[PDB]
Design a protein around this ligand. Structure first.
Ligand code: CD4
Ligand code: BCL
Ligand code: BCL
Ligand code: BPH
Ligand code: 0V9
Ligand code: V7N
Ligand code: V7N
Ligand code: V7N
Ligand code: V7N
Ligand code: V7N
Ligand code: LMT
Ligand code: LMT
Lengths: 62, 71, 180, 49, 39, 101, 273, 60, 60, 59, 60, 56, 40, 39, 39, 39, 39
């Protein structure tokens, strides 16, 4: 009985909340290299703060 | 101007020349074959006075128009 | 005095200026990842990934392609730098990673990455000299050496590749300047 | 006055002069054929009734 | 590379080939003109 | 398939590596180029064999010896072309003053 | 601010125009002469878009519509409130996109990179230039361009398609669509493979090029290899834009009938006419 | 003249020529076959006076 | 004339020849089968006077 | 005459020929597309018979 | 005066100049050919008083 | 006043300036060329009292 | 490899005989076709 | 390798085969013209 | 880097060229104004 | 680069080149004006 | 490698060839004009 609110609109805002969540996650992943930034005012992290640098386990011998 | 044969490998100049002449020949033939006047495969046996000529001016009737009315 | 560069001035976005020869010091497009691990890259089975073809008997040139060995190398100043005498192969994805060039103007053999070689006529015919646009024939004498002649570390790969990459800016003074 | 030809190539000079004359003479004829009504009177003389 | 001796020899085959082609082409044009003039 | 050195132009019949006993300037140019390359290619192949013998790695020694033999065979093929063109160069009037080989 | 490794790369040189004059950064951004011309055209074009919104019926983002002129104006500039504004914005767009590609070339030259990125972007600029310059020029009026509005340009796409009754039958469009779909499939496989070797299940060692190569070869039957998949992705993505440019430039200038009746040549091949 | 067969490989030029004639001959036959005048598979038995002729110039 | 088989690998020629004749034969048969006069599977039992003929000149 | 020091004849000659070949082909097709000079179809018309574009209406 | 050619490479400026003049010449000829009054390929033989003119302002 | 050429190398200004003025001159001519009052290629012969005026 | 001049003539004789036999069959086919339904 | 004698021999065959093919095509056009002239 | 006397020499040319251009443009506007005033 | 004398001689050709070009254009404009004036 | 002799000789061919072409084209325009004048 809500006239303006309809399921297609509800779905679309559900997607927007997921999508803006996804962009945040990807921008955290993008900062695992090269961060924190150098600046004349000291280190800078940008936003969001980056995920930490990964360490990779090599194949033990072969 | 026979010094042109010093500037290039003559084998390659013949390959380029043959290409240019062959392509230009086919261009002119298919242009003529697409025309009304020189559609020789269909109308080649027509006499020169019978062969089509492009009109100097089409007529019209004042209410007729080739294109629909626009905006 | 050992810092490789200085700011061009004090403003926030200003370029740096190299203090020495930037191709050798590794500044700008000649720079390499100086922290990179000084060990060889390894295959899935743990053997050295990049080795001279002479040291793996399973490898060979594909039948339709030119054999680069014995071909002259033509440098950026159109002088002959040397001749190819060995190929280095990637054993994980079979390809030629480097030519090894015997220098004409000395006793060194140096590596030449495949990505810096152009074949005449884009390889459609000729196929009988190698063209190295990046560096002059004199600059070949300073190409970084590998510690061994049967293997190459990930650091040496970065140093050698960075050296040729720098030549597109630093080989001649004019290459740094605008076209207009 | 002859020194004006020093440093020239005589085959260029004759090439330029010859081409200029050919251009000028053609222009002058097609102009003159327009003004003088000739060969238009010539054609009309021998034309068929 | 190319010698003048070959360059001059070769130009003779070019001229005769060219003339032969132009002779045939101009006969072909005059045949076409007789059949159906384009002016 | 196209040959390596004339490549795309082999579709149009230009094929200067073919065995030629008449004098021909195009084949002579090609033979001078390919002799220098193949002499250097033999020189490389025997340097490679010497290196692998020093390391003593038998299956690599075996292949380097096989490669050297193949490189010698290709050089002999070009030296045969060089000599037969040399024979023709001496007698065909328009030919080069410099030897082919 | 700079990445932790960045400073040694910030040298002078590599410009095409201007030399040292603009050879500096602003925050992360490289400026350069084409940076200055980029900002000029971006700013002028964007403010003229805002002016177009102001004199139109609404500020609703989806509904703003800066339309090209009537076809009667031909290749002239129309009155600014009658579509001449769309023409000025189009010149700014061409200037901004061209400046962006040349600035990319200056950046790539400064880093010792190949020119692949500027030329790949040239594919997109070609499609835009086809839509607003080449196709309208061949049709003889700038009014054949598409309008600048988030949904009104979709109305243009709809109507242009139905000018040919059944635009799916356009043969270059079928190829362009096939490239777009094949590109998206290839991108999902390349992304998946690199991630799945670099992020294996917990406690598994990091994967290798060999594992990637083996798996891919069970998917397609053949190994594409590392440089091959990037060549393929570039071929597919740029070919999609090039075939798009072809499919729209043949619609109108060269083919005027419905697209289904173009296929009459296939039905009349002599082996089965 | 014959020294052209030093400049070019006979074995190779013959394949190029024979391929060219095959293509040329097939094109000319298919152009004729789709005409009205020379659709010989349908109308080849018509006499020369009876075969089609393209439309003439006469008009109002 | 047998020297031609020294210039060309006869096994390459026989493959190229046989493939050419196969395609050419099929092309001719399908052209004829699509025609009206020679649609022999439907009308092959008609006599030569009963078989279709393509349209003539009008000659009106 | 020294302009030929700055430009290689082997390049210049092809560049000039390519320009002229394009320009000539452009002018012919522009004329052929016109009504007055569609000479394949109408070249046999006399100069008074050949088409002329519309004039000023004066009204 | 000639020190302009010490500031700039004359070769570059000649290529820049000729490119600009060629495009400018093409644009102006196209603008004229695309107009009514100067569409000379169709209407070039009209006299100066019969060539089109764009409309005046109204009388009021 | 001359010290702006110590800030800006004049040879790199003058190429930029020429481009700006070339574009500006082209823009102004085309704006006029397709106005009613100043479409001189088609109405240049009119004389000032006969030339269109954009009244409405 | 290669082919010997004796092998070339030996091949050529069969090749001619094949070609001639094939042309004969095709000739009979055309004459049967002609007498059934002439195309000119 | 190829002698000039072999180039001369091949030229003989190539010219003869070309001319013989043109002769056969001449007879074809003679027959075609007899059946249905194109001018 | 350019010296101050080089900058001073260029400045004299650059002022004179600019002002000469502006003078020519003013005459062009005078002709345009006489032919068809815009105010 | 170039010597100031070599610049000096080049400029004379560039000047006379520009002058000859202007001259032809000026004649072309006067012909165009005599055929169909635009003011 | 160019020389002033090579340049001066080539200049003669380019000048004479250009002018000869312009002569043949001037006749072509004379013929075209006589057939169907464009002014
Ligand atoms: C349609 C479906 C597909 C659509 C697909 C769209 C995909 C878009 C993906 C890219 C968007 C992010 C771009 C980016 O990260 O730029 C770097 C910049 C700064 O962070 P940093 O790089 O890590 O650190 C540098 C900085 O800290 C210090 O640098 P410096 O001192 O040298 O320079 C000065 C500062 C000043 O800061 C700014 O100016 C930032 C202004 C950012 C405005 C644009 C935000 C767009 C968000 C779009 C997502 C969505 C927003 C709703 O730094 C800079 O100068 C950095 C300049 C970066 C310029 C980026 C311009 C991107 C414009 C994209 C427009 C996209 C329009 C669609 O980041 C930010 O400022 C924050 C961005 C955060 C990620 C967006 C997440 C939004 C989630 C929803 C809201 C969350 C609210 C809490
Ligand atoms: C064998 C070496 C020569 C040759 C030698 C001769 C001789 C010798 C004579 C001819 C004759 C003729 N030749 Mg011849 N001819 C050759 C190649 C050709 C070719 C060709 C495509 O290459 C063509 C079109 C011709 C065409 C012709 C005719 C115009 C002419 C009349 C006979 C005829 O109809 O022959 C039909 C044959 C063909 C069209 C093709 C096959 C050619 C045959 C194999 C050549 C020998 C034909 C000869 C007549 C045989 C009998 C005469 C003997 C001396 C007893 N010849 C070869 C290259 N030709 C005769 C002539 O001019 O009479 C007035 C003549 O006396
Ligand atoms: C290397 C020779 C020189 C040259 C030397 C001469 C000489 C000498 C004479 C001419 C003459 C003429 N030249 Mg010339 N001329 C050259 C190049 C040209 C070019 C050109 C495109 O380059 C053109 C258009 C002309 C044009 C002309 C005409 C104005 C005129 C009549 C002949 C003619 O139409 O020849 C068209 C051009 C050619 C076919 C090519 C040039 C060479 C040929 C052989 C013609 C000129 C020589 C002529 C037959 C000599 C006759 C005897 C003398 C009267 C004593 N010359 C070259 C560069 N020219 C004659 C003249 O002045 O008459 C008033 C004349 O006596
Ligand atoms: C060729 C294959 C595909 C391609 C590739 C591609 N795009 C690229 C690149 C490449 C390789 C870049 O390097 C470049 C880049 O830097 O990306 C980050 C870019 C890029 N592709 C972009 C977008 C984009 N690409 C698209 C398409 C494609 N890009 C192709 C399918 C589309 C489509 C289909 O809609 C869009 C929207 C940008 C993010 C970027 C180019 C950025 C750029 O040019 O920046 C300078 C200009 C501005 C920031 C703004 C200009 C504003 C104007 C002056 C005013 C507005 C006028 C405009 C016409 C209005 C339109 C309204 C719409 C609603 C219709
Ligand atoms: C990788 C995964 C990413 C997922 C991100 C989320 C994105 C999209 C999911 C959207 C689901 C949309 C449901 C659509 C149906 C709908 O809206 O129908 C409504 C009833 O209301 C409803 O159903 C309410 C719907 C509420 C939505 C809540 C959040 C999303 C739920 C799904 C999450 C899945 C996760 C896995 C009827 O509408 P009407 O117009 O007939 O009503 C008026 C009649 N007069
Ligand atoms: C209708 O509308 C549109 C289309 C728009 C209208 C406009 C059309 C336009 C613009 C047309 C332009 C046309 C043109 C312009 O130039 C056309 C130019 C044509 C030309 C140049 C033709 C030249 C032909 C030359 C030939 C064939 C030479 C052959 C030589 C041969 C065979 C000999 C080979 C060597 C031998 C045998 C032996 C060597 C021995 C050696 C070495 C030894 O013995 O050692
Ligand atoms: C619809 O109408 C459109 C299309 C619109 C209209 C337009 C059409 C146009 C433009 C047409 C153009 C046509 C053209 C132009 O050039 C056509 C030119 C055709 C030509 C050149 C044909 C040449 C044929 C030559 C042949 C067949 C040679 C055969 C040789 C043979 C058999 C012997 C080989 C050697 C042997 C056996 C010896 C080996 C010895 C050895 C090994 C030894 O001795 O060891
Ligand atoms: C539709 O209506 C809309 C468009 C919307 C309406 C609005 C329009 C608007 C907003 C317009 C704005 C216009 C504008 C604003 O400023 C325009 C600004 C114009 C300007 C500044 C022009 C400047 C020109 C300068 C020139 C020509 C200089 C030439 C110099 C020369 C030749 C000499 C160089 C030195 C040499 C050679 C040294 C030799 C010696 C040496 C080396 C030695 O001796 O060593
Ligand atoms: C629709 O209407 C719209 C379009 C909208 C209205 C708007 C119109 C507008 C805005 C027009 C703008 C026009 C314009 C500017 O702005 C126009 C500027 C024109 C100019 C400057 C032309 C210059 C021409 C110069 C030429 C041809 C030189 C020829 C000769 C040379 C070079 C020498 C050859 C010899 C050499 C080289 C060897 C020397 C010796 C050597 C080397 C030695 O000895 O070493
Ligand atoms: C219709 O509507 C639109 C289209 C819109 C209207 C507008 C149209 C417009 C804008 C037109 C512009 C036209 C134009 C502008 O520039 C046109 C310019 C034309 C020009 C430049 C023509 C020049 C031709 C030159 C030729 C042919 C040279 C021939 C030389 C020959 C033969 C000799 C070769 C030398 C050799 C071999 C060397 C031997 C020695 C050696 C090697 C040694 O000695 O070493
Ligand atoms: C006397 C005759 C002697 C035997 C002649 C043999 C002729 C063979 C066919 C000639 C024509 C082939 O067609 C012609 O091929 C050449 C080959 O470079 C093309 O040439 C062009 O394209 C090729 C690739 O295709 C490029 O490598 C080349 O650099 C470029 O010039 C021409 O664009 C084309 O027109
Ligand atoms: C439709 C396909 C082609 C149909 C045409 C077939 C050819 C018809 C005419 C053939 C006539 C005989 O043709 C003739 O054969 C002889 C060998 O017998 C060739 O003779 C050739 O080889 C001999 C050596 O064997 C050389 O000494 C001689 O100089 C050379 O010409 C001739 O060059 C050719 O003219």
């Amino acid at each position: 009985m809500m006239e303006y609110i309809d399921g297609a609109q509800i779905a679309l805002y559900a997607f927007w909340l997921f999508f803006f969540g996804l962009i945040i996650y990807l921008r955290r992943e993008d900062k695992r290299e090269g961060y924190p930034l150098e600046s004349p005012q000291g280190p800078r992290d940008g936003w969001p703060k980056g995920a930490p640098k990964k360490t990779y386990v090599h194949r033990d011998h072969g | 101007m026979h010094r042109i044969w010093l500037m290039y490998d003559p084998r390659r100049v013949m390959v380029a020349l043959v290409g240019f002449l062959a392509v230009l020949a086919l261009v002119i033939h298919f242009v003529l074959l697409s025309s009304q006047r020189y559609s020789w495969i269909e109308n080649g046996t027509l006499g020169a006075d019978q062969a089509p000529v492009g009109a100097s001016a089409p007529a019209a009737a004042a209410e007729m128009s080739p294109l629909p009315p626009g905006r | 005095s050992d810092v490789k560069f200085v700011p061009a001035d004090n403003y926030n976005g200003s370029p740096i200026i190299p203090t020495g020869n930037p191709m050798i010091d590794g500044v700008g497009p000649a720079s390499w990842a100086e922290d990179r691990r000084d060990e060889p890259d390894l295959t899935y089975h743990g053997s050295h990934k990049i080795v001279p073809m002479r040291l793996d008997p399973t490898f060979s040139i594909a039948k339709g392609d030119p054999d680069p060995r014995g071909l002259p190398v033509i440098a950026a100043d159109k002088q002959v730098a040397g001749t190819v005498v060995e190929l280095w192969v990637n054993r994980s994805e079979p390809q030629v990673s480097y030519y090894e060039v015997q220098l004409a103007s000395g006793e060194r053999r140096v590596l030449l990455p495949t990505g810096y070689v152009q074949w005449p006529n884009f390889g459609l015919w000729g196929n009988d000299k190698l063209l190295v646009k990046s560096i002059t024939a004199a600059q070949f004498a300073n190409v970084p050496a590998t510690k061994r002649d049967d293997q190459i570390t990930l650091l040496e790969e970065d140093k050698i590749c960075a050296y040729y990459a720098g030549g597109h800016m630093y080989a001649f003074a004019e290459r740094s300047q605008p076209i207009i | 006055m002859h020194r004006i030809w020093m440093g020239t190539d005589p085959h260029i000079i004759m090439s330029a002069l010859g081409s200029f004359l050919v251009g000028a003479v053609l222009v002058m004829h097609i102009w003159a054929y327009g003004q003088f009504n000739w060969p238009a009177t010539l054609k009309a003389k021998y034309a068929t009734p | 590379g190319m010698t003048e001796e070959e360059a001059r020899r070769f130009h003779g085959y070019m001229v005769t080939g060219t003339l032969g082609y132009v002779v045939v082409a101009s006969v072909a044009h005059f045949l076409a003109w007789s059949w159906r003039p384009w002016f | 398939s196209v040959p390596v050195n004339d490549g795309i132009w082999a579709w149009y019949g230009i094929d200067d590596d073919r065995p030629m006993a008449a004098w021909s300037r195009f084949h002579a140019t090609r033979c001078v180029e390919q002799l220098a390359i193949n002499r250097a290619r033999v020189g490389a192949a025997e340097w490679a064999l010497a290196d692998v013998q020093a390391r003593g790695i038998v299956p690599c020694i075996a292949k380097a010896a096989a490669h050297l033999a193949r490189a010698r065979a290709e050089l002999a093929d070009w030296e045969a072309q060089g000599h037969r063109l040399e024979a023709a160069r001496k007698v065909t009037p328009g030919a080069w003053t410099t030897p082919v080989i | 601010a700079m990445l932790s490794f960045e400073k040694k790369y910030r040298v002078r040189g590599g410009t095409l125009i201007g030399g040292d004059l603009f050879d500096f950064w602003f925050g992360p951004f490289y400026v350069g002469f084409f940076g200055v011309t980029t900002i000029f055209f971006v700013t002028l074009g964007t403010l003229l878009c805002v002016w177009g919104a102001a004199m139109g019926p609404t500020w609703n983002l989806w509904q703003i519509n800066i339309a090209p002129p009537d076809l009667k104006y031909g290749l002239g500039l129309a009155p600014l409130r009658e579509g001449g504004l769309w023409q000025i914005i189009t010149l700014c767009a061409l200037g901004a996109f061209g400046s962006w590609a040349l600035r990319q070339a200056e950046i790539a030259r400064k880093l010792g990179m190949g020119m692949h990125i500027p030329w790949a972007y040239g594919g997109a600029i070609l499609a835009y230039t086809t839509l607003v310059v080449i196709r309208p020029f061949l049709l003889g009026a700038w009014g054949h361009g598409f309008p600048y509005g988030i949904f009104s340009h979709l109305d243009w796409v709809s109507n242009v398609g139905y000018q040919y009754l059944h635009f799916h039958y356009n043969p270059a469009h079928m190829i362009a669509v096939t490239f777009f779909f094949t590109n998206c499939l290839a991108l999902a496989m390349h992304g998946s493979l690199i991630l799945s070797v670099t992020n294996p299940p917990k406690g598994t060692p990091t994967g290798t090029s060999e594992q990637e190569n083996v798996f891919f070869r069970d998917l397609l039957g053949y190994s594409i290899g590392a440089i091959g998949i990037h060549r393929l992705g570039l071929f597919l993505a740029v070919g999609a834009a090039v075939w798009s440019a072809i499919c729209i430039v043949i619609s109108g200038p060269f083919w005027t009938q419905g697209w289904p009746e173009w296929w009459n040549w296939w039905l009349n091949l002599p082996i089965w006419k």
